[PDB]
Design a binder for this molecule. Structure first.
Ligand SMILES: CN(C)c1ccc2c3c(cccc13)C(=O)N(CCNC(=O)CCCC[C@@H]1SC[C@@H]3NC(=O)N[C@@H]31)C2=O
Ligand SMILES: CN(C)c1ccc2c3c(cccc13)C(=O)N(CCNC(=O)CCCC[C@@H]1SC[C@@H]3NC(=O)N[C@@H]31)C2=O
Ligand SMILES: CN(C)c1ccc2c3c(cccc13)C(=O)N(CCNC(=O)CCCC[C@@H]1SC[C@@H]3NC(=O)N[C@@H]31)C2=O
Ligand SMILES: CN(C)c1ccc2c3c(cccc13)C(=O)N(CCNC(=O)CCCC[C@@H]1SC[C@@H]3NC(=O)N[C@@H]31)C2=O
Lengths: 125, 125, 125, 125
């Protein structure tokens, strides 16, 4: 709860070397910035999202998600990613996610508008 | 741009009868509430997300995404959904999305933590 | 069972105008050809897959999936799609699917190797 | 080509401890069996799929996919999984996949019919 808040807030790194900095609010909000090590991305981008401010205490992870639109002062990649996953606490804390990356397309190209992938975030690296 | 802002802001309905009410901010923010016609959901839930405040003008859609954590004053479904998609404007304006719904799980059950689906939102119904 | 076999076997069409011709075997096999109305595709491509030869009889759909590699005598698109979904029988019989389309990539590009989408197949159109 | 055939054919293991045994045919076929270490699964299940019998030689992976219906002599889990991904050869050869697992459902429950995940297969473990 406040446990999750404290667990989630901070800097995370994924397997690609991207950096996710986030504050979890007591109200279930996630707010922060994201810097992608790959793709059409430079510097930091705003992120917002939500999390289960009251997960179970049977050892279950904590559900959460967030979005980045790939526009900032330096680039506009006409796209947006959402990550959906769960926070697991402890000595090797992790956010395990799957993500959808959608590009704005013509109607003709809409069938190929969305990439899918997975990112695992840790507190080190 | 301001076009997208004006296009996106408002009430949308999906094929299931769910209701998405959203304000698009000039800064690329999405803020609002979501009421799901199905699943472990009651009343409205906070939503936040982002959108490409400056899509292309070659007739491409506008990328966007948002999250809902399935906790409010009435229920806690220990889960969170992200929708990723694009807004298409005009007489039959649409937000075409794919979504990931993750439940908090034990580590044993993490492989089955995430549902995937698609929702199409329109301004009527 | 033999019901499913009879239900599934035949020609289906999706919302894009693609054509899926399939034989369901008594052993749970699916075999046939696919012709895509869109993308880097021409003529027919082999398809194979499986289905639950013994679904429930509580009105549940019948789970199934199949793959196409996008290589034939005319083109090689260095890619393969899998469709996962369920057959629903009756007067407006449907196969409702989600699909993953993966392209062979460099290791650098693997994070963007896979598109996701949804196709609905019917017996007419 | 024959390279891919030789690369792919054999026994693979994923991070969960599941075992995938496959023969790649010269015609682009994949045929074999799958034994899942997790879920509603026992013993081996038939699998079929396809692969790009002629990938590029710029170091790109080889696209492929396959399906398992979760019915055999011991169990019927009313479901089917498709894996979509790419084979990468060499000293630490890998098949990197994403998967869709669909359960037969009522029409009411169709929105939650499909799980999504990722599996990485290697030749050892
Ligand atoms: C239609 N058709 C041929 C395309 C043409 C162009 C594009 C696409 C795209 C998606 C789907 C198809 C196309 C797409 O997303 N785009 C925009 C790309 N946008 C970007 O590169 C922004 C960085 C995204 C980084 C990802 S987020 C998940 C992962 N985790 C990380 O930390 N980093 C990676 C295109 O141009
Ligand atoms: C591990 N294993 C056996 C499960 C056990 C329980 C659950 C799950 C879930 C996901 C995956 C597996 C399980 C899951 O999400 N859950 C929480 C469900 N949470 C909810 O029902 C909240 C409403 C979500 C409504 C969806 S959002 C996309 C779509 N579009 C709409 O407008 N409405 C629908 C479980 O309990
Ligand atoms: C890495 N990065 C920038 C890409 C560059 C090139 C490509 C990709 C792809 C996928 C992901 C990224 C890229 C991809 O799949 N490719 C191959 C495309 N392959 C094809 O076009 C084959 C037809 C597929 C038709 C689809 S199947 C689901 C749907 N349902 C239907 O009936 N028809 C549609 C690329 O080139
Ligand atoms: C609708 N609602 C509440 C559900 C109720 C029951 C079920 C579901 C399912 C999917 C989605 C929702 C539900 C589902 O798939 N099912 C069948 C499960 N079927 C099985 O357990 C078969 C083993 C699958 C093993 C996976 S394959 C990807 C991964 N990689 C591996 O090597 N092993 C794992 C349900 O019962």
């Amino acid at each position: 709860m406040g446990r999750d808040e404290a667990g989630i807030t901070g800097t995370w790194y994924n397997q690609l070397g991207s950096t996710f900095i986030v504050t979890a609010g007591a109200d279930g909000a996630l707010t922060g910035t994201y810097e992608s090590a790959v793709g059409n991305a430079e510097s930091r981008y705003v992120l917002t999202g939500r999390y289960d401010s009251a997960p179970a205490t049977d050892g279950s992870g904590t559900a959460l998600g967030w979005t980045v639109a790939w526009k900032n002062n330096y680039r506009n990649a006409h796209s947006a990613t959402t990550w959906s996953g769960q926070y697991v606490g402890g000595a090797e804390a992790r956010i395990n996610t799957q993500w959808l990356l959608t590009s704005g397309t013509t109607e003709a190209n809409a069938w190929k508008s969305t990439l899918v992938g997975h990112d695992t975030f840790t507190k080190v690296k």
